[PDB]
Design a protein around this nucleic acid. Structure first.
Ligand code: DTP
Ligand code: 2DT
Ligand code: MG
Length: 1011
DNA sequence: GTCGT
DNA sequence: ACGACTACCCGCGCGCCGCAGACTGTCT
DNA sequence: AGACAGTCTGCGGCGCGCGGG
């Protein structure tokens, strides 16, 4: 009756026969049986050492449902043909591009709209250029409005100029540039092209577009990338440039280029630096000042020079692209990369105008009131203190007040006249005078972040006033008889120089001296000093009675800081967004579906925001957004944290979204398990694959119960260990999570956890230094082994590394921890590209009404009508299983576990939030939001409308034309170098747990080598 | 790239 | 001089130091 | 009636801590 589960030697489930046939086809192995016997004995020893042999795992019923068929005999052929289908039209336009440039017109004309100039003929007026490929540039005035002012375009046969009606006679500055994007397929090349895309008229539609905007900055960051090592390497480049500019003679190859050949590899991302590095062109940026004016009559003059400057920028961009493009084509030869690059450039954000304005007003109105209410009282306190000038004894017999500078400057007297020498507050103490910046200032300036805040307040650490020392920071005084006693609680003595400084400071006031000075502890360590006392770290110490105040203002200050830090950080970015309403452009906001189907209300308000996304702005080739990839989540106390809830779907539509579970951990486990050619060969892989999230048995949750912390903190703890964190930092993090623990406990727990995870180290001559005896030793050794290759490539697709981080350019400096993370963090991007390609292929094939809305890292959302929601979820599941199967096949394994095949949850909602069940209550927002829906695979299958429907026959016919070429995987050519006996003896030494075993196996290997 | 034995 | 080291992004506020710039007071 | 040498008086760039994903 029921199908029997299929289980490999270790207790893990695989896919059913139906899914096996529909995904992997007919594949057989058993070629390496003789090697697999010895490998299985070694794996048996490794698993029995850690007590994981014969342990129970989760087993469920098989899952069977019909998938769409594949287009090849292997996954690689299928993905290549789909990528060629999806990137065929525009890539032919990218090649055969013109290399010669036509001449410029002698004189330009000021007419509203689009004017075409062809050399040898009279200029004409056109509605739109109607060209396959153009180079584009836009200029706007940013102090009057956000709308464009003029535009220039170049093609292979003519020049095009666009002029706004605002500068040709008129008072309405709202206008947009038309390009007929909804009907004509075209490629537009530019530098930071998203800013230019935001000013196009036909981009403000819910219906999809047919234009491809390409950026040269991403192409420069990918190949010939800037170092971007998050290192002083950026400072190193700047100081080299300063030194080279300073000295006419440049013997660079003599000293600094010999030690650091990386210096002459790349430059900065700006257009000036990129153009200067790639070509011998010098550009001028002065003319930008002409666009900083408020009046428009200045733009009427100097028309010719501004237009010529725009044309020069266009020419420079054209030459830069012509130089860069083939190198990027050589570095990334797979079509899926280009398809994903095209796909990641069409984001859109629906909003509403009035709600946006109300949200902004509420946030600002709360923030300013909260700031002013606490800033009012400190001035009164200062004015109360300031009347003690006449009597010295009060402030000379007080502990806190005696650390101020009370010296007064005498009144100057020029001969026979008033001084009038720009004096500031004559006959006043120095600390009072220092508050006022200028003569015009009448009210003192003070914030809660000023240095003298503890002195103005009365702050005590264990009933001892705080003292400021220039060398060490904040300190407190301990009597002699207890100096040893306070050393029992891990209090570090201050530096000696501070001791003499305190000695003379007291001696100037007499009072002899008692005790020594200890330092207030700092969370990062004993070496770092303390300079602030109202941060998050000292909030805990305000409770439990360690830090105490004689005034009621400190706790309020802590509340206000914690409530307003994020809004203070992000207010300028948030308030400057460009929002376009429906009232101004009544012929553009067209529905995604072809049929209108009414759904019209009494003048409803809608708006669209186009994000400024740079597709490839990282060495690991991730995307960059300054505002929308850094948005905070909703919190009860935090002000203005409901930003992402402002994205609302129009009536009759919804959002469908998904997020990937434990991506890089799974990738690392697969890389570790690839050696034994079995799932669960290593201990870490068996621990990772034995549980799943829906029953609360995943690795992060288990670490959370072992360490007694949250899952988010456990993620940081687990990733830090993998990416190279020491045991001391781990103990510091453990104390950070639980601040009521002693240092000794954290040290023993950290050492015990690190000993089990990583074994001892063995150093030899013929074999280099390696770890042994640990559960993850093989994974680590494989990480440095692949990091030390001559030509590193991503294991799945085969993308090369940037020239800055290559071995030959790095002579002395190494940057190893940045070289190790690169492969995993780039596979994380290959995953997203494959997902996007699969989803958009399915959307084209089955005629679904959907469009990509937003793509945060490892999280994707789509805007879908009411009818086709479950079909979109189904397509998401199919894309996920195809991507995982491709990753498994590229490593040399033709099997897939059942537990990790599908998404845990799929979210259907009307707004963007982390969880569908959140209420999103903030101090700014007093209204709850209704909950959404979340579904897993079985409940999705139970739905009646989950089925796809009938396909289109012509799509497969078009796809079948493209060609396929066989390529060898990268790990095979890596393995070609090493001899088999070397690998077997090395792994046999790695699986041992004792030094004598390693020595005797090394001796046997040496004897075999001699024999 | 940067800092201790 | 060798070995050990969480990784990739974004940005605001406060203290410090190097220079323009105005005010006299002899000095011519 | 200038010449110029001190003599203060701010103003701007830099860097590093401190927070968000
Ligand atoms: N401190 C960190 N250090 C290094 N990498 C991190 C760190 N935090 C997050 N990441 C990495 C790992 C992830 O691939 C990715 C973050 O995506 P994320 O979804 O939050 O983690 P996750 O997918 O493993 O958990 P979950 O299953 O809950 O989604 O970047
Ligand atoms: P936020 O919702 O917290 O994070 C979403 C994405 C996932 C990946 C990226 N990211 C976040 C954090 C906190 C990190 O340390 N590293 C990341 O890459 O932000
Ligand atoms: Mg995730």
């Amino acid at each position: 009756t029921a199908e029997a589960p299929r289980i490999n030697p270790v207790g893990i489930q695989y896919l059913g026969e139906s899914l096996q046939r529909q995904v992997f086809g007919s594949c057989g192995g058993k070629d390496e049986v003789e090697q697999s016997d010895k490998l299985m004995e070694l794996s048996k020893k490794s698993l029995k050492d850690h007590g994981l042999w014969g342990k129970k795992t989760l087993i469920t019923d098989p899952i069977s449902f019909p998938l769409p068929p594949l287009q090849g005999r292997s996954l690689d052929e299928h993905f290549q043909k789909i990528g060629r289908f999806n990137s065929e039209p525009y890539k032919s336009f990218c090649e055969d591009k013109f290399t010669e440039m036509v001449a410029r017109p002698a004189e330009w004309l000021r007419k509203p709209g689009w004017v075409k100039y062809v050399p040898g003929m009279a200029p004409v007026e056109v509605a739109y250029p109607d060209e396959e490929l153009v180079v584009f540039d836009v200029e706007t005035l940013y102090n009057v409005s956000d709308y464009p002012t003029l535009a220039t375009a170049l093609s292979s046969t003519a020049w095009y100029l666009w002029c706004s009606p605002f500068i040709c006679g008129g008072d309405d500055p709202a206008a947009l540039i038309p390009l007929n994007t909804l009907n004509k397929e075209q490629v537009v090349i530019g530098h930071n092209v998203a800013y230019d895309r935001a000013r196009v008229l036909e981009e403000y539609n819910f219906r999809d577009s047919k234009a491809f905007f390409l950026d040269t900055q991403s192409l420069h960051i990918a190949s010939f990338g800037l170092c971007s090592r998050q290192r002083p390497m950026f400072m190193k480049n700047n100081k080299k440039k300063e030194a080279e500019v300073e000295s006419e003679v440049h013997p660079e190859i003599s000293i600094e280029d010999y030690d650091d050949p990386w210096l002459n590899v790349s430059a900065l991302n700006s257009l000036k630096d990129v153009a200067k590095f790639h070509c011998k062109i010098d550009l001028d940026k002065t003319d930008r000042d002409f666009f900083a004016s408020t009046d428009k009559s200045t733009i009427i003059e100097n028309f010719q020079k501004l237009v010529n400057y725009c044309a020069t920028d266009v020419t420079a961009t054209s030459q830069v692209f012509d130089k860069i493009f083939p190198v990027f084509l050589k570095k990334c030869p797979h079509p899926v990369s280009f398809a994903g690059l095209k796909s990641l450039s069409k984001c859109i954000l629906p909003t509403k105008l009035n709600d946006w304005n109300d949200y902004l007003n509420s946030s600002e109105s709360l923030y300013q009131q909260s700031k002013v209410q606490i800033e009012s009282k400190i001035v009164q306190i200062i004015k109360d203190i300031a009347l003690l000038k006449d009597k010295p004894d009060f402030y000379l017999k007080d502990p806190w007040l005696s650390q101020l500078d009370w010296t007064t400057k005498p009144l100057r007297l020029t001969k026979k006249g008033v001084p009038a020498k720009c004096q500031k507050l004559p006959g006043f103490p120095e600390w009072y005078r220092q508050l006022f910046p200028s003569k015009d200032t009448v009210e003192p300036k003070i914030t809660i972040k000023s240095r003298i805040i503890p002195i103005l307040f009365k702050l005590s650490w264990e009933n001892s006033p705080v003292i400021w020392s220039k060398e060490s920071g904040w300190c407190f005084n301990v009597p002699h008889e207890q100096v040893e006693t306070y050393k029992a609680k891990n209090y570090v003595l201050a530096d000696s120089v501070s001791q003499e400084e305190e000695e003379i400071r007291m001696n100037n006031l007499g009072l002899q001296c008692t005790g020594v000075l200890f330092k207030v502890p700092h969370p990062n360590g004993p070496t770092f000093n303390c300079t602030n006392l109202l941060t998050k770290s000292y909030n805990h110490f305000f409770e439990k009675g360690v830090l105490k105040s004689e005034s009621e203002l400190a706790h309020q200050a802590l509340q206000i800081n914690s409530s307003g830090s994020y809004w203070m950080s992000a207010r300028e970015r948030i308030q400057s967004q460009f929002v376009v309403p429906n009232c101004k452009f009544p012929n553009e906001f067209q529905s995604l579906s072809a049929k209108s189907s009414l759904n019209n209300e009494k003048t409803n308000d809608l708006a669209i925001i186009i994000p400024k996304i740079v597709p490839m702005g990282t060495i690991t080739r991730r995307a960059v957004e300054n505002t929308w990839l850094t948005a905070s989540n909703a919190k009860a106390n935090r002000i203005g944290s409901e930003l992402k809830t402002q994205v609302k779907a129009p009536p009759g539509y919804c959002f469908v979204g998904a997020d990937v579970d434990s991506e890089e951990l799974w990738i690392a486990s697969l890389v570790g398990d690839s050696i034994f050619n079995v799932h669960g060969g290593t201990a870490i892989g068996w621990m990772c694959l034995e549980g799943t999230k829906n029953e609360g048995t995943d690795l992060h949750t288990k670490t959370a119960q072992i360490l007694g912390c949250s899952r988010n903190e456990a993620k940081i703890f687990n990733y830090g260990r993998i990416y190279g964190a020491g045991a001391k930092f781990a103990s510091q993090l453990l104390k950070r999570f639980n601040p009521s623990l002693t240092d000794e406990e954290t040290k023993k727990i950290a050492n015990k956890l690190y000993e089990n995870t990583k074994g001892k180290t063995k150093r030899s001559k013929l074999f280099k230094k390696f770890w042994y005896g640990g559960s993850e030793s093989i994974l680590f050794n494989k990480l440095e082994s692949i990091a030390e290759q001559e030509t590193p490539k991503t294991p799945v697709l085969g993308c090369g590394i940037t020239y800055s981080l290559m071995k030959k350019n790095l002579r002395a400096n190494s940057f190893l921890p940045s070289r190790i993370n690169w492969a995993i963090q780039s596979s994380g991007v290959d995953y997203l590209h494959l997902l996007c390609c699969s989803m958009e292929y399915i959307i084209k094939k089955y005629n679904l009404e959907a469009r990509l809305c937003i793509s945060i890292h490892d999280e994707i959302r789509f805007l879908v009508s009411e009818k086709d929601k479950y079909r979109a979820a189904m397509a998401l599941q199919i894309s996920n299983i195809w991507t995982r199967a491709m990753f498994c096949q590229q490593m040399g394994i033709n099997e897939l576990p059942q537990n990790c095949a599908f998404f845990s949850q799929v979210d259907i909602d009307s707004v963007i939030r982390k969880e569908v069940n959140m209420d999103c209550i903030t101090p700014s927002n007093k209204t709850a939001i209704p909950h959404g829906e979340a579904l897993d695979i079985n409940q999705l299958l139970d739905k009646p409308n989950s089925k796809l429907g009938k396909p289109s026959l012509d799509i497969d016919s078009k796809v079948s034309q493209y060609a396929y070429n066989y390529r060898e995987p990268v790990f095979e050519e890596y393995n070609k170098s090493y001899t088999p006996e070397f690998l077997k003896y090395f792994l046999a030494m790695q699986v041992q747990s004792d030094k004598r075993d390693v020595n005797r196996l090394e001796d046997e290997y040496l004897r075999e080598c001699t024999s």
